[PDB]
Design a binder for this molecule. Structure first.
Ligand SMILES: Cc1cc2nc3c(=O)[nH]c(=O)nc-3n(C[C@H](O)[C@H](O)[C@H](O)COP(=O)(O)OP(=O)(O)OC[C@H]3O[C@@H](n4cnc5c(N)ncnc54)[C@H](O)[C@@H]3O)c2cc1C
Length: 508
DNA sequence: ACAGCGGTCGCAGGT
DNA sequence: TACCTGCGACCGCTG
């Protein structure tokens, strides 16, 4: 066994055992030749990034929990997880040599950083004689294949995208890999010999530098929770079958949607498995919704954005971004700060920004409200600033999804009906007329009657005192006047669209 | 050509 | 309940 070669699976996304072709392939190969190989399933953790402010504490905790679950599940297959601290550039040269790696597998990703990181790894592997097998299992459809089927271009409308993907085959969804047979623990490398726990899963203390930023642990990380949560969602087949996104509440105290996004983002849940389960249900339920508003339709939106994103490295910026309207957003530092911390003076907006910071998830339409307010609706601040804040706070932060939906909300791409503007006062009332959600997340306003809790500036000073919260003292004065600025911004939007039109027809 | 259709998720005021 | 209309006058696709 001093002569064994090592098979490595590199986890980045795809933090699950189920439906993981890259992982299954390694386990299958090991069991094929019994005394031949050692198996190392690894996650590479750069210990310097633990302070990167672009990752908030709630998301670190989710990753910590996820790695622990992944180690637990691997232990059942007579394996374990190896969390190797460092950067791939230095880690791979060392372990290819140390472990005598024969093969390396991972799930592909389309993000710019990942494309260049993986090309580097492929380059090293090729030069060092390591075979590399990659798999597209993060999405149901391979963006490269969609773009190729569409003659070299990513489809820019959803219905056209659907028309392409129904021409594509959907791969088989796999189970969990097989238990390893006759597999002693690998020999310690030089790092392990110095410290036996060198590759153990990180503790909370090691991942979470700022525990004071942690909120209630409403969505625990890992594949186990992912499947449990999915199964609980799929249980009411009528709800599943009749689901229409636009009719779900943004302010219900309990989520009106699945809340599978963080699990889909990390790959704790396979999108292909979830797609498969939904199809089985739709087949059973004669009365059901269809894309774009159906539950399957939502998975297809995820697929849609991954595809437009895969063709555009600047997807997360305005400048140099092929899809994006060039719009003269403004710098408004004080306003940005107030929006970021849920101190705009609009209680609905503030409640949402507060839930997001505290819990790491807010409903899609709650994201609409704050994203509209920040950009074209009210503050006239760049969607890129909003994206930055969401990136920090969201458990489900997803490069492609965040960028795509921020462009949609700001009417920069995909959505163009800018005359439709969410009211920070009116929008939430439809689903929460008593303002329970505001009372919860903005407790200072909790005694305000429903008749002015969405618009506290309507309360006289004697009323404010009776409610125990005086504006400008206990809660902020509204930063801008929606009824004025949104009308001026609609005009700004039309003006920018016109400039973009000229430029287009001008390139001809 | 260039107008007409459809477009995941607007508001306010109708009935 | 769950539509309907005016507001002003978007885009991408289609033929
Ligand atoms: C400004 C803005 C920023 C966003 N940033 C992210 C993000 O960083 N990461 C992320 O996962 N979602 C993002 N979303 C999309 C959407 O709001 C979330 O995916 C959804 O709220 C997740 O909740 P759920 O799992 O209950 O969704 P469900 O309605 O139960 O849908 C199931 C799954 O379908 C996918 N899905 C649903 N809606 C969308 C959508 N609009 N776009 C793409 N996929 C979707 C998600 O994977 C979701 O988990 C953003 C939306 C907006 C408006």
């Amino acid at each position: 066994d001093s002569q064994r070669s090592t098979l490595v699976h590199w986890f980045r996304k795809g933090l699950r055992l189920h439906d993981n072709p890259a992982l299954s392939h390694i386990f299958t190969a090991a069991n094929a030749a019994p005394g031949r190989y050692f198996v190392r399933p690894i996650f590479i953790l750069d210990p310097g990034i633990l302070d990167w402010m672009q990752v908030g504490a709630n998301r670190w905790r989710f990753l910590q929990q996820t790695l622990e679950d992944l180690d637990n599940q691997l232990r059942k297959l007579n394996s374990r997880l190896f969390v190797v601290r460092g950067k791939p550039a230095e880690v791979f040269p060392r372990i290819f040599k140390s472990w005598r790696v024969e093969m390396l597998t991972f799930e592909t990703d389309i993000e710019p950083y990942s494309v260049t990181r993986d090309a580097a790894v492929q380059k090293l592997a090729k030069a060092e004689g390591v075979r590399v097998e990659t798999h597209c299992s993060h999405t149901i459809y391979n963006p490269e294949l969609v773009i190729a089927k569409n003659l070299g271009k990513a489809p820019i409308t959803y219905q056209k995208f659907l028309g392409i993907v129904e021409q594509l085959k959907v791969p088989k969804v796999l189970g969990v890999p097989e238990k390893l047979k006759n597999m002693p623990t690998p020999p310690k490398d030089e790092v392990e010999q110095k410290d036996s726990a060198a590759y153990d899963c990180p503790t909370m203390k090691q991942l979470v530098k700022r525990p004071e930023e942690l909120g209630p642990n409403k969505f625990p990380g890992g594949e186990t929770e992912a499947l449990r949560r999915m199964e609980e969602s799929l249980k009411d087949e009528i709800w599943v079958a009749r689901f229409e996104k636009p009719n779900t509440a943004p302010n219900s105290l309990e989520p009106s949607t699945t809340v599978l996004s963080p699990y889909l983002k990390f790959g704790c849940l396979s999108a292909r498995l979830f797609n498969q389960k939904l199809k089985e249900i739709i087949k059973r339920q004669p009365k059901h919704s269809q894309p774009p508003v159906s539950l399957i339709g939502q998975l297809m939106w995820r697929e849609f954005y991954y595809t437009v994103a895969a063709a555009e490295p600047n997807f997360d910026r305005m400048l140099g971004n092929v899809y994006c309207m060039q719009i003269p957003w403004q710098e408004h530092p004080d306003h940005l700060e107030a929006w970021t911390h849920g101190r705009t003076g609009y209680p609905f907006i503030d409640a949402i920004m507060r839930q997001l910071r505290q819990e790491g998830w807010i409903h899609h339409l709650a994201r609409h409200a704050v994203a509209c307010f920040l950009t074209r609706g009210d503050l006239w601040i760049s969607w890129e600033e909003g994206q930055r804040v969401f990136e920090q706070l969201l458990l489900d932060q997803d490069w492609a999804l965040n960028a795509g939906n921020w462009m949609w909300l700001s009417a920069s791409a995909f959505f163009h009906q800018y005359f439709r503007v969410y009211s920070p006062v009116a929008f939430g009332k439809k689903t929460d007329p008593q303002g329970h959600y505001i009372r919860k997340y903005v407790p200072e306003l909790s005694k305000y009657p429903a008749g002015c809790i969405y618009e506290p500036w309507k309360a006289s000073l004697v009323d404010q005192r009776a409610y125990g919260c005086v504006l400008g003292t206990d809660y902020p004065h509204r930063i801008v006047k929606h009824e004025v600025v949104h009308k001026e911004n609609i005009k700004r939007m039309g003006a920018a669209y016109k400039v973009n039109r000229e430029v287009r027809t001008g390139k001809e």
